[PDB]
């Protein structure tokens, strides 16, 4: 996170870190959505231009900073994930080897329904991005930044990448008075918003892509969680 601040203890108990198993290195952020399911970006697992195709034997997740380390049973990547062109449908689900124990530092975030998404997804409304990634383009504390949702035509005019309805963008405009963005290591992490209707946090987006971190006139792009909920529902079953 660029231009953020230290998060208070227990601020994001759904925070998950995706780690390379060997050699061990932080790869991506992720989010806890149940005691057994973890949400992240597809490009964190599969990205052929960088020769990246991680399996369950290549990865570990870290949750709760009290801390929990777990293997993955299965990886689910959206079948229409489009890495060649624009990272359309940049979403993947990680099934944990076994269900984890919940605590003060480990707690799942909510997924939004139609009504929640209609209420919260308006240009100007701020969401929250958290992660352990770079401060500049190695924090010892989870970092947090709050960022405003941006008008879709402003998002499209900021980049040459074709923007689909499965993406939104967020971040300050040049001269808006503030800065901030996800950066290397935060990708796959959650963009959350607090609902006034029921006092709960919902994950609205997944850090997907940007063109540099915290650049004037550029915005972060996030996988639109509600619009991919049909696929989320299908794989999780229950």
């Amino acid at each position: 996170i660029v231009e953020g601040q230290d998060a208070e203890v227990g601020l994001s108990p759904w925070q998950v870190m995706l780690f390379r198993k060997s050699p061990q290195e932080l790869l991506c952020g992720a989010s806890l959505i149940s005691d057994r399911w973890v949400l992240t970006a597809a490009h964190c697992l599969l990205y052929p231009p960088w020769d990246k195709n991680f399996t369950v034997d290549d990865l570990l997740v870290r949750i709760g900073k009290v801390e929990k380390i777990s293997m993955l049973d299965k990886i689910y990547i959206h079948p229409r994930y489009n890495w060649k062109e624009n990272l359309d449908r940049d979403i993947a689900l990680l099934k944990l080897k076994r269900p984890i124990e919940l605590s003060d530092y480990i707690h799942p975030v909510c997924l939004p329904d139609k009504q929640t998404a209609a209420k919260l997804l308006h240009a100007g409304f701020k969401g929250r991005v958290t992660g352990w990634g770079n401060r500049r383009e190695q924090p010892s504390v989870l970092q947090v930044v709050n960022l405003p949702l941006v008008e879709r035509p402003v998002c499209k005019a900021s980049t040459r990448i074709r923007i689909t309805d499965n993406m939104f963008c967020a971040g300050y405009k040049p001269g808006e008075g503030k800065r901030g963005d996800a950066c290397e290591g935060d990708s796959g992490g959650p963009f959350v918003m607090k609902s006034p209707y029921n006092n709960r946090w919902y994950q609205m987006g997944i850090v997907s892509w940007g063109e540099g971190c915290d650049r004037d006139g550029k915005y972060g792009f996030y996988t639109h969680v509600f619009r991919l909920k049909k696929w989320i529902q299908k794989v999780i079953d229950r």
Binding site: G10, H107, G124, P148
Partner: peptide
């Protein structure tokens, strides 16, 4: 999960975090 989105160290203890108001401020313009 019935208890999703409610953090034990905040909402469950009726303590709001330090930058929550920034989000609620953005809701009313």
């Amino acid at each position: 999960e019935a208890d999703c989105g409610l953090r034990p160290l905040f909402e469950k203890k009726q303590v709001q975090d330090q930058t929550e108001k920034e989000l609620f401020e953005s809701y009313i313009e």
